[PDB]
Design a protein around this ligand. Structure first.
Ligand SMILES: *CC(=N)NCCC[C@H](NC(=O)c1cccc2c1C(=O)N=C2)c1nc2ccccc2[nH]1
Ligand SMILES: *CC(=N)NCCC[C@H](NC(=O)c1cccc2c1C(=O)N=C2)c1nc2ccccc2[nH]1
Ligand SMILES: [Ca+2]
Ligand SMILES: [Ca+2]
Ligand SMILES: [Ca+2]
Ligand SMILES: [Ca+2]
Ligand SMILES: [Ca+2]
Ligand SMILES: [Ca+2]
Ligand SMILES: [Ca+2]
Ligand SMILES: [Ca+2]
Ligand SMILES: [Ca+2]
Ligand SMILES: [Ca+2]
Lengths: 627, 627
């Protein structure tokens, strides 16, 4: 600020520490005068030992400490000229501390990304530490549990002033009306800013005081919300009862709202999910053993909640949110809204488990909206550009027509607004169900980049079956093990022209994603592995699985839950099974084959489709990313 | 793409020029085999003279020219091993040109800012070259005038193929459904993409062909539109009548939609605007002469269109939009919607004059929504960071309360979405009317940075009147010239305690913007000039002008149209007038003083409030900015 001094009259002013204060000396300097001196109380440091009256040369004032009383530091400007006796202009200053503080170093003036960057973190309080209610913590105007505070971002106001200072001044706290629907703040425990209140007079005393606030966000980043929240503190002069308050000081702190981040298959599993239904028991024991082998909690949805809905992968996706002071997992509930509609609301969402949802809840959606169509890559680097939490992957058509499908725009928008997993659209529309879980998986790897990508591959199967026919097993029966289905011999399959045509075309759709995924994830052929897999086209020439779709597997660490192909039996073992094993076991992967044939496959899915996994969040802090 | 070759069968493929084509040789390589050779037609260049069968070493294919006929370049892979006689795998390729082209160099794969950057430009076609209609060109699905094409962005498709190539292939053009409401495209002249149509099969022939498209945008950048539009061309294989089309190629071009940019007072005026009303004639001659002096076209609104509304500055603001191929001015019509409601629609908007509007048209607005509260700085550099078109400036309160006002959020959002003039909010709410035109102006300057900032300044006036009282004119009468108003002597004014209080407080509100503007525009005191100006607080302690508000002037180049203060007369001239002149004329500025006293001032405005100016757009191209 610029303080204008006068021989006319003594001047009074406030001075916030850490602010630059300056002096206009010339404007009102009396005449007969060429020169000036500054003299000052020891509390005041003065920068530019006597000087000419030149309006271009600058005087600057910093106070070392807070004042004990109004006016208690003094400055004196002596004007003098040759003929003339000294004329003095007096200045009385009061020094104060006003520190609005938040964890801007991320350890427990603007927001910037990276290890060197600055800006506080703030979490959407979308869990339900309240044991009673149905609602998210953030929807009411109260802290109901102490527990609830652990989610919230702490901010403190530190003042030091003279003891009578709030006779003449008042502090306000505020946030833009633009942003009051996306924040709430509690004084310590009652509310002071929120969607209803954009500003508040703080009731503060002179001397030393500290005032803690707790902050919760009410909205994730989206198309209309970049994810920044500013809170400002203003200091007002209210000395004059006739005039309005005039601003003396403002200071700010910037929160960034934590994005929703997903976990790839190569993050250590923590909890597995499935559905118990009629005649699915042998399925669930295989899973239960597989869960147990990887030390995962195991959560099942019984038929009375199911409502026939066996596809636990599809209603939801378990991401997380992360702050220096708290991390917690958060369910992206899919608007698909089938029988499993309530599983995310009733029994997943809870204390230290968040909830979010997007898109139209009644109608208006498609198969691509299911979260079998939503996956994440593991960390990659693409031509030098790092993606330390991977890149979200989701299915689309190659172009829009009246026959095409897409994932709702509100979802695509949400996922891009989280920024840090930089979504990549894939071409999955060619499938009947149209989910990228139907031709890709990833699995941990002890070497290279620590994963391999898995792709469904007819080519691989045509080869495998050709290699047998060659060595004398042209008669071997696919579907051995299933009575109540017509077995087909390798010789017949290979010589089926229509089938070959179908799978050629599926190869094209697939290859197109291989190159796509090679580009956007920076992969090399050595990072990829092909699984022998046969499809067939059906209603509307859309692609289905010929035999169980092995790449639709469950990845619990090194324990893979693969769909049992029931391939042709050679040397007392199914040869597909053996072919996967020869490809996976070299990498430390233990392949269980789970019969899902009459339970899942004939209903158009497999093991991955039947289940879901909460996995451990990345150690890497998303804010040290530079997206 | 990866082409898989076979001794089993000869392979057929298409190859788009400028794309990388690669060969999978091992996967289907017959046995007895260690080694291979590639032989190829002269059109094919092949990179890696015989080689071992190692799946990790890469073969790459580039075609030099387009094919004259299907299959007419050939490749031959010879597999061989010690015992074994050569087995050949044959490959037939067809080379094609597919070039979707646009002015990405900005002279007439992604979008990037700056002189070194790349990306085509696209203009919102918000003018009305159609002489008949009321509507903006962009609202219907037709080009109605050849003239209209001059606004649109040209894009061309260049193909070279064999003559029968579109027996088996078809080209599609498309845009995301996300963006089809914000674009339209015309083939040359009929529509093919727009809000109704997201994709189109192009009807193309083999051999050489060129196809021009013309593109218009329907939306400026906003909170929900960053301002990018992608159009994609896909090539489809339709060889198989039984199977769906499978993608073979996609290519894209990125347009950025041109922002709406405002012009500061130091851009050469082109056209002046005002209102003829009852008893305002002497006002308009002063303007008409001043307009004439600066060679400006002069546009007046007669009372029958006015509807009493004399404030021509306030309904609108004349910005422009700019592309390599066309620039045209564009009216930001303010939602204030008073008597002047139709001036922007009926008589400004036209051929080569655009229109845009934002915010609620019926109700819901305030004084800060008027465009007396919307200005732009001239170009500055702030701590190294360039703002080559200035920084928009607009009035706000210091914090939100129930008594405060702001400019509607939809406007603030719009102005920020244009990015290139990086809006800066100021504190103007303290005024009755609350417009930044009421304490700031800018004027050209022959030196320093080529402008000076003007600020209203009571301090300056108190000094001026004190300097007179001192030299014997304490009796001199403010308001000499106005009978029908009570004159006040300098001596009385100076000794009025309440008035001094009011103006102290206004000094605070003002100084707070001085520092604000010093920071965000990087100004030094030497860039600023103070105008003596007195205010008084009135209803709700809101600030008004004591005498006509001189800084509320019209800037037509070096010709300034200043409000006549009617200051105290000393030496046959008003001393305020003389004080401005001593401050402005040193810089080449010619100060006319225009009596607006009973016409404008007593109705709460002055000369700048009565008028408006279209000014010449910056030469600097906004896209070479790096915001
Ligand atoms: C693998 C994956 N992520 N998705 C599997 C979902 C397959 C769903 N199948 C059925 O619901 C189904 C199909 C055929 C017969 C039956 C059933 C069933 O549940 N009971 C008999 C599925 N989900 C969708 C959603 C939209 C379109 C088609 C779908 N198929
Ligand atoms: C300088 C500038 N950019 N704005 C000037 C607008 C002043 C407007 N004044 C009047 O409309 C007005 C006030 C008092 C008496 C009269 C009039 C008038 O036109 N006829 C008699 C103005 N515009 C607004 C808008 C909102 C609140 C107050 C306003 N005052
Ligand atoms: Ca709560
Ligand atoms: Ca909570
Ligand atoms: Ca749901
Ligand atoms: Ca919690
Ligand atoms: Ca998923
Ligand atoms: Ca038109
Ligand atoms: Ca036009
Ligand atoms: Ca209007
Ligand atoms: Ca035009
Ligand atoms: Ca304006």
């Amino acid at each position: 600020t610029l303080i204008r001094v006068t021989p006319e009259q003594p001047t009074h002013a406030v001075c916030v520490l850490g602010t630059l204060t300056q002096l206009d000396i010339c404007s009102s300097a009396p005449e007969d005068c060429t020169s000036f001196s500054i003299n000052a109380s020891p509390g005041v440091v003065v920068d530019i030992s006597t000087w000419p009256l030149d309006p271009g040369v600058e005087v600057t004032l910093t106070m070392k400490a807070a004042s004990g009383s109004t006016g208690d530091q003094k400055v004196q400007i002596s004007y003098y000229g040759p003929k003339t006796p000294p004329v003095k202009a007096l200045l009385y200053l009061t020094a104060v501390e006003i520190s609005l503080c938040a964890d801007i170093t991320r350890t427990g003036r603007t927001w910037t990304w990276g290890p060197c960057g600055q800006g506080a973190i703030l979490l959407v309080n979308c869990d339900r530490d309240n044991l009673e209610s149905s609602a998210m913590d953030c929807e009411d105007d109260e802290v109901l549990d102490s527990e609830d505070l652990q989610d919230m971002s702490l901010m403190t106001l530190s003042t030091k002033t003279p003891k009578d200072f709030f006779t003449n001044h008042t502090l306000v706290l505020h946030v833009a009306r633009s942003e009051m629907d996306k924040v709430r703040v509690f004084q310590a425990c009652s509310v002071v800013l929120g969607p209803k209140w954009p500003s508040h007079y703080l009731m503060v005393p002179g001397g030393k005081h500290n005032m803690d606030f707790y902050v919760e966000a009410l909205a994730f980043p989206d198309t209309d919300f970049p994810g920044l929240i500013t809170l400002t503190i203003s200091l007002l002069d209210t000395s004059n009862l006739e005039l309005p308050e005039a601003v003396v000081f403002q200071d700010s702190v910037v929160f960034r709202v934590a994005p929703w981040i997903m976990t790839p298959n190569t993050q250590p599993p923590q909890e597995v999910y499935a559905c118990s239904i009629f005649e699915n028991e042998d399925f669930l024991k295989s899973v239960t053993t597989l869960a147990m082998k990887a030390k995962c909690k195991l959560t099942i949805c019984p038929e009375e909640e199911n409502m026939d809905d066996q596809w636990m992968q599809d209603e939801m996706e378990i991401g997380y949110i992360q702050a220096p002071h708290k991390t917690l997992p958060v369910v992206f509930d899919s608007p698909r809204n089938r029988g499993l509609k309530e599983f995310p609301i009733k029994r997943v969402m809870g204390p230290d488990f968040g909830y979010v949802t997007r898109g139209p809840q009644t109608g208006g959606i498609s198969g691509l909206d299911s979260f079998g169509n939503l996956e994440v890559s593991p960390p990659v680097t693409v031509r030098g550009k790092e993606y330390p939490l991977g890149r979200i992957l989701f299915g689309d058509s190659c172009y829009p027509s009246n026959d095409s499908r897409q994932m709702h725009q509100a979802l695509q928008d949400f996922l891009s607004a989280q920024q840090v997993q930089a979504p990549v659209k894939l071409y999955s529309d060619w499938l009947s169900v149209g989910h990228v879980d139907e031709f890709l998986s990833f699995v941990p790897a002890p070497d290279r980049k620590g994963f391999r990508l898995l792709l469904a591959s007819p080519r691989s199967c045509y080869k495998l079956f050709q290699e047998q026919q060659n060595e004398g097993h042209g008669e071997a029966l696919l579907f051995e093990g299933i009575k109540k289905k017509k077995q087909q011999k390798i010789k017949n399959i290979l010589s089926n022209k229509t089938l070959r045509e179908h799978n050629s075309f599926v190869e094209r759709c697939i290859d197109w994603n291989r190159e796509l995924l090679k580009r956007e994830l920076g992969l090399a052929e050595s990072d990829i592995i092909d699984i022998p897999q046969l499809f067939k086209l059906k209603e509307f020439s859309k692609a289905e699985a010929f035999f169980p779709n092995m790449v639709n597997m469950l990845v619990l660490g090194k324990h893979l839950g693969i769909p049992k192909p029931f391939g042709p039996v050679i040397n007392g073992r199914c040869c597909l099974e053996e072919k996967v094993c020869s490809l996976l076991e070299p990498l430390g992967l233990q392949c269980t084959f789970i019969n899902d044939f009459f339970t899942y496959h004939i209903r158009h899915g497999e093991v991955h489709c039947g289940t879901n996994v909460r996995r451990k969040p990345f150690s890497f802090k998303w804010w040290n990313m530079v997206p």
